[PDB]
Amino acid sequence: STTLFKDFTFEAAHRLPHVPEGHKAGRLHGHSFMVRLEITGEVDPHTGWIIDFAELKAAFKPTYERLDHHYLNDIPGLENPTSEVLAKWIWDQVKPVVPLLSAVMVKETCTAGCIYRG
Amino acid sequence: STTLFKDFTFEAAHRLPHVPEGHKAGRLHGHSFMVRLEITGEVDPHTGWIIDFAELKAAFKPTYERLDHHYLNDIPGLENPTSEVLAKWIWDQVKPVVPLLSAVMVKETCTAGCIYRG
Amino acid sequence: STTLFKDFTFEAAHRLPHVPEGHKAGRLHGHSFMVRLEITGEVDPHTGWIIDFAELKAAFKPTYERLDHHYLNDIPGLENPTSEVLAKWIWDQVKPVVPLLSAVMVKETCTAGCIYRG
Amino acid sequence: STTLFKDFTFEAAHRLPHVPEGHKAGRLHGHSFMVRLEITGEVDPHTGWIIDFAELKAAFKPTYERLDHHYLNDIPGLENPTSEVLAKWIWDQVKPVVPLLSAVMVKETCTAGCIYRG
Amino acid sequence: STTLFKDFTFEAAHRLPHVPEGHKAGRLHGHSFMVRLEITGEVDPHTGWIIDFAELKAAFKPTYERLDHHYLNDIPGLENPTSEVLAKWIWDQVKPVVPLLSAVMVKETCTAGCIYRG
Amino acid sequence: STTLFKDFTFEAAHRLPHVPEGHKAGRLHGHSFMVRLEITGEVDPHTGWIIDFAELKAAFKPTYERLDHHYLNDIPGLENPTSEVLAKWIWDQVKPVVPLLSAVMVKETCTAGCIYRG
Ligand SMILES: C[C@@H](O)[C@@H](O)c1cnc2nc(N)[nH]c(=O)c2n1
Ligand SMILES: C[C@@H](O)[C@@H](O)c1cnc2nc(N)[nH]c(=O)c2n1
Ligand SMILES: C[C@@H](O)[C@@H](O)c1cnc2nc(N)[nH]c(=O)c2n1
Ligand SMILES: C[C@@H](O)[C@@H](O)c1cnc2nc(N)[nH]c(=O)c2n1
Ligand SMILES: C[C@@H](O)[C@@H](O)c1cnc2nc(N)[nH]c(=O)c2n1
Ligand SMILES: C[C@@H](O)[C@@H](O)c1cnc2nc(N)[nH]c(=O)c2n1
Ligand SMILES: [Zn+2]
Ligand SMILES: [Zn+2]
Ligand SMILES: [Zn+2]
Ligand SMILES: [Zn+2]
Ligand SMILES: [Zn+2]
Ligand SMILES: [Zn+2]
Numbered sequence: 040s041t042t043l044f045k046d047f048t049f050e051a052a053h054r055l056p057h058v059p060e061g062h063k064a065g066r067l068h069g070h071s072f073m074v075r076l077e078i079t080g081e082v083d084p085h086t087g088w089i090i091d092f093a094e095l096k097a098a099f100k101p102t103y104e105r106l107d108h109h110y111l112n113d114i115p116g117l118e119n120p121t122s123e124v125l126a127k128w129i130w131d132q133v134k135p136v137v138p139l140l141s142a143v144m145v146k147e148t149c150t151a152g153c154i155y156r157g
Numbered sequence: 158s159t160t161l162f163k164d165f166t167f168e169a170a171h172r173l174p175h176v177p178e179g180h181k182a183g184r185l186h187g188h189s190f191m192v193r194l195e196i197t198g199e200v201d202p203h204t205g206w207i208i209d210f211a212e213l214k215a216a217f218k219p220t221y222e223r224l225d226h227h228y229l230n231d232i233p234g235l236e237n238p239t240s241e242v243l244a245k246w247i248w249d250q251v252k253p254v255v256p257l258l259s260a261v262m263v264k265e266t267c268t269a270g271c272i273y274r275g
Numbered sequence: 276s277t278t279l280f281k282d283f284t285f286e287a288a289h290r291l292p293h294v295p296e297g298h299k300a301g302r303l304h305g306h307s308f309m310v311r312l313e314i315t316g317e318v319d320p321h322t323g324w325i326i327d328f329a330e331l332k333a334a335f336k337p338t339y340e341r342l343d344h345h346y347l348n349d350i351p352g353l354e355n356p357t358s359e360v361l362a363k364w365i366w367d368q369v370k371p372v373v374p375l376l377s378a379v380m381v382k383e384t385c386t387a388g389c390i391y392r393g
Numbered sequence: 394s395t396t397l398f399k400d401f402t403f404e405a406a407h408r409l410p411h412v413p414e415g416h417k418a419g420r421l422h423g424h425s426f427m428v429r430l431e432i433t434g435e436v437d438p439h440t441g442w443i444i445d446f447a448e449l450k451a452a453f454k455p456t457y458e459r460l461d462h463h464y465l466n467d468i469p470g471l472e473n474p475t476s477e478v479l480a481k482w483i484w485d486q487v488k489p490v491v492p493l494l495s496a497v498m499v500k501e502t503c504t505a506g507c508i509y510r511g
Numbered sequence: 512s513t514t515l516f517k518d519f520t521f522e523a524a525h526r527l528p529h530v531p532e533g534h535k536a537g538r539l540h541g542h543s544f545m546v547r548l549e550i551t552g553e554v555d556p557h558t559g560w561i562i563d564f565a566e567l568k569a570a571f572k573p574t575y576e577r578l579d580h581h582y583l584n585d586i587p588g589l590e591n592p593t594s595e596v597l598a599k600w601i602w603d604q605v606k607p608v609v610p611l612l613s614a615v616m617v618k619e620t621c622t623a624g625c626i627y628r629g
Numbered sequence: 630s631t632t633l634f635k636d637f638t639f640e641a642a643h644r645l646p647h648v649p650e651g652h653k654a655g656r657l658h659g660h661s662f663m664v665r666l667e668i669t670g671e672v673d674p675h676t677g678w679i680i681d682f683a684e685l686k687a688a689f690k691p692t693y694e695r696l697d698h699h700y701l702n703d704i705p706g707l708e709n710p711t712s713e714v715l716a717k718w719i720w721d722q723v724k725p726v727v728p729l730l731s732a733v734m735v736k737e738t739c740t741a742g743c744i745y746r747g
Binding site: 321 | 645647709710711712713714716717739740741742743744745
């Protein structure tokens with residue numbers, strides 16, 4: 040078994056609407072978000088790879104454009120943009136064009152994140 | 158499933174008591190230790206998260222104050238303070254208060270660590 | 276000569292109001308900003324330090340709290356919140372309470388920043 | 394169960410022979426490679442570890458010396474030196490001298506790599 | 512005084528011609544090179560910046576393309592491609608187009624590097 | 630002007646003898662300490678360098694061996710081993726064997742350090 044992964048970062052704004060009154064996350068703020076796409080599958084004997092890294096980047100690119108330098112709450116499905124909802128949403132957007140996807144990781148900060156799978 | 162993780166670092170001294178005579182780990186020394194706490198669970202449809210990262214941080218804290226800026230060998234159960242032993246010890250202290258705990262990782266140095274699960 | 280520094284991270288939203296329209300920075304977005312404060316001065320023979328790292332952390336606190344998990348455009352003096360303007364703005368808030376401040380570095384992203392001095 | 398891991402970096406050149414003529418990986422180039430060896434086993438009740446980190450390092454050394462500061466295409470088995478092939482290859486060199494080995498990870502760049510377990 | 516900086520990484524092979532016979536840098540190998548371009552200048556009142564990060568990026572591009580996924584020794588002026596020689600050579604390419612340039616840093620590996628300032 | 634730099638890390642214990650009664654630094658503890666040595670001089674036309682990175686690693690080794698996996702307080706001159714004192718102390722050990730030394734930086738934690746320059 041072989042797993043490949045590629046990391047991306049994007050700069051965005053968000054706010055959490057269902058947190059308690061005066062919770063710091065309920066104010067408009069932002070992060071440099073780290074996402075990791077992980078894919079599992081067979082290695083081709085000839086090319087020596089599961090899929091070209093550049094090909095994983097290209098598949099993620101339209102989702103990436105929509106996230107980077109944007110305000111996440113304005114994206115349908117992200118109206119509650121926690122790390123967990125974000126990772127599921129990314130899975131849902133990318134799984135159909137990367138059928139070998141087996142994990143998506145979202146880090147909001149250098150110290151805290153989330154991993155979504157199947 | 159969805160996993161959450163939060164990272165902490167604490168600064169401590171320790172010594173390994175059972176290593177051979179010349180061994181550098183037998184001398185009083187210290188490290189910047191890194192701990193990752195991992196938990197696995199259901200995402201609440203309303204809050205959009207498993208628990209607040211800050212809840213996690215708050216639960217580890219009593220344990221954190223005991224490790225940070227201390228000499229590990231003086232803590233009961235850490236009298237042989239390897240990473241393997243520390244990881245299990247941290248699991249035993251934190252699992253009772255975070256039942257969703259699914260792994261603890263401890264890194265002594267930037268290049269070396271271990272993961273205790275179940 | 277001896278210089279000390281301490282690093283801080285805060286999560287915030289901002290947008291640049293004087294970019295041509297269509298410029299990515301003109302949209303509401305965010306970053307995990309890193310700030311480095313740098314002081315220069317005489318080491319006390321008794322304490323062995325210039326001042327305590329925690330004293331530096333404490334003098335920065337009221338400024339830190341205005342920036343962390345906030346929208347920077349709403350802070351007066353920050354209506355054009357570029358890295359350059361922000362480093363100056365922080366200098367200006369922090370120099371009165373830390374007279375040995377010799378530099379302020381602001382990093383918007385992991386790959387890009389600014390340093391302000393004197 | 395408990396898992397131990399150890400990280401190494403080696404500096405190397407390589408080119409991919411089976412990419413289309415345009416492709417940038419077909420040019421002679423290089424990377425600071427990162428490799429992680431992962432072992433899973435029983436923690437000895439006296440030593441308090443699975444095996445010494447230093448032992449894992451000493452076992453990887455001969456493989457390490459072949460990789461470091463070398464051109465990978467000249468190494469038998471690495472004539473198509475992708476991340477995937479490197480992972481499996483390292484697995485193959487290392488599993489016989491470290492039977493606890495449970496994963497090998499190779500990172501070609503900071504944001505991209507691959508995990509192998511047989 | 513304000514300084515701004517921007518980091519880039521590129522993947523390249525090289526080798527050193529003037530080291531003694533068994534020296535490891537004399538073998539064909541590679542690295543993930545890191546370069547930091549630094550500029551110093553006045554902050555414009557309207558833009559709030561010295562120049563856009565993206566402008567510094569665009570000026571460096573023709574030079575960056577020559578370096579990434581290439582063999583350094585084949586580039587004229589880089590037949591002895593040490594960090595020191597690389598740093599000066601980048602300065603020499605970029606300085607004429609970016610007169611505000613005040614420093615070029617190169618790092619071959621995570622822990623070693625060089626800074627050229629004219 | 631050209632400057633070259635090399636980073637090292639060592640694992641050590643210390644405590645601060647001159648902090649008030651309850652100060653956490655006054656307890657026995659430890660750090661992964663990072664040290665950067667910086668040197669400044671002329672690049673030899675033939676070697677393409679100031680000195681070999683490995684040469685600087687060799688000049689620092691006897692001093693490095695005294696710090697790594699050791700209790701700093703028992704080293705003469707380090708009875709009060711703050712970052713400031715340690716950076717001056719390392720300068721003092723390293724200057725006589727590296728006349729081109731222009732800076733020593735010491736970092737105790739990931740986010741706080743000291744730079745001493747003569
Ligand atoms: C910035 C941070 O306060 C906010 O983004 C936040 C706070 N707590 C959180 N907690 C969880 N579990 N998930 C999150 O995304 C999350 N997010
Ligand atoms: C500093 C380091 O030598 C010492 O803490 C050390 C050395 N070797 C080790 N080896 C293992 N397996 N686990 C450890 O915690 C460990 N720990
Ligand atoms: C998001 C980022 O592109 C935007 O914040 C941005 C773009 N270019 C920039 N350029 C400079 N010089 N300073 C900035 O703060 C800056 N900031
Ligand atoms: C340099 C880099 O472009 C080249 O080494 C490259 C490109 N795409 C890749 N894609 C995969 N899947 N694996 C690789 O090792 C890989 N390797
Ligand atoms: C990779 C490394 O072994 C080799 O490239 C190397 C070794 N020692 C060096 N020493 C100096 N000063 N500069 C270098 O670029 C340098 N470069
Ligand atoms: C571990 C940390 O609490 C302790 O070593 C500490 C605390 N505050 C400090 N403050 C200064 N200025 N220098 C130090 O070395 C220092 N060192
Ligand atoms: Zn947030
Ligand atoms: Zn140790
Ligand atoms: Zn921005
Ligand atoms: Zn490559
Ligand atoms: Zn090299
Ligand atoms: Zn300390």
